[PDB]
Design a protein around this ligand. Structure first.
Ligand SMILES: [Mg+2]
Ligand SMILES: [Zn+2]
Length: 338
């Protein structure tokens, strides 16, 4: 019946200064997946403290601790879309904040919403995509299919359910106006994680980069938020070869698992979901050239200091070309360690 023991222990000695985590914690070279999972909740508090959102928005620490624990427990354990993914995506948001000086481009509340969105953007993911929800006529599909972005709307709904859980509403004291603004930002930012959305606004993103970002342009704020969210979501591609390789293993383990379920339903899965047809190296090269590289290229055109990011993504693409080892699907052991 010791309901408060868990969060109390987390805050026992206060919030740990971000500088004390790792001297390289705020560098683009840092790999957040290396941090022990049991230390991630405190790391979240550390980043929120460094960005000073707790002071700026008068956030209640105990409530925030409970909220962070709830978000972490809100993730299931599929190979890729788990808490460590949300954690690493959130860390990249922090990196962009520190390295690109986002406070000079976005309003403070927008950056706060972006970080919280990163934490909650994949809540309750089961390892299957939107196409599958519709094909299996799931309860989530029946609920959101009409509006599109089925899983994305579910993730947002789960985030709201957490805020509505006793003792977890970190925005409870907000005025009605600011509360609605925060929930609307979270909705729009999480919805931006749907690739379909990114592809639709891509030309608007290029135009903004072409004419130059304008802090007084409301549309630019919305567009930048979408680009940044996508940038955080695919940040595993900005690390070293070992990370890109490992993440590929996790994502395809998920993709092939879904593909197997589709075949069992009497359906024909897309090639990239079929372990008997997919050739991972080529699929990664395609992903890099058509999705990842263009996103970080845009980021570079807007932020010169983001060049090293685009550079790493391009390098990793090169690595895949030197790997393209010859079999389709994944090895018997489901590993690419070799
Ligand atoms: Mg997602
Ligand atoms: Zn994600």
């Amino acid at each position: 019946h010791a309901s408060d023991d868990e969060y109390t222990k987390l805050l026992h000695d206060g919030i740990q200064p971000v500088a004390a985590i790792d001297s390289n914690f705020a560098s683009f070279t840092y790999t957040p997946r290396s941090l022990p999972e049991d230390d991630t909740s405190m790391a979240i508090l550390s980043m929120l403290q460094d960005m000073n959102f707790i002071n700026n928005y008068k956030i209640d620490c105990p409530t925030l601790a409970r909220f962070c624990l709830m978000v972490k427990k809100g993730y299931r354990d599929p190979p890729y879309h788990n808490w460590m993914h949300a954690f690493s995506v959130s860390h990249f948001c922090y990196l962009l904040y520190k390295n690109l000086e986002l406070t000079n481009y976005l309003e403070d509340i927008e950056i706060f919403a972006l970080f919280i969105s990163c934490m909650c953007h994949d809540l309750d993911h089961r390892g299957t995509n939107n196409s599958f929800q519709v094909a299996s006529k799931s309860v989530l599909a029946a609920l959101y299919s009409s509006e599109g972005s089925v899983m994305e709307r579910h993730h947002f709904a789960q985030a709201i359910a957490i805020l509505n859980t006793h003792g977890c509403n970190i925005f409870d004291h907000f005025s009605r106006k600011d509360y609605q603004r925060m929930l609307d930002l979270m909705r729009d930012i999480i919805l931006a994680t749907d690739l379909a959305h990114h592809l639709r606004i891509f030309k608007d993103l290029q135009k903004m980069a072409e004419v130059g970002y304008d802090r007084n342009n409301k549309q630019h704020h919305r567009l930048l938020l979408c680009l940044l969210m996508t940038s955080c979501d695919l940040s595993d591609q900005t690390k070293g070869w070992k990370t890109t390789r490992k993440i590929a293993e996790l994502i395809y383990k998920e993709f092939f698992s879904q593909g197997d379920l589709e075949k069992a339903m009497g359906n024909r899965p897309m090639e990239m979901m079929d372990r008997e047809k997919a050739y991972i190296p080529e699929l990664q090269i395609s992903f890099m050239e058509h999705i990842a590289m263009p996103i970080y290229k845009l980021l570079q055109d807007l932020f010169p200091k983001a060049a090293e990011l685009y550079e790493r993504v391009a390098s990793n693409r090169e690595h895949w070309t030197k790997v393209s080892f010859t079999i389709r699907g994944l090895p018997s052991n489901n590993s690419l360690d070799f």
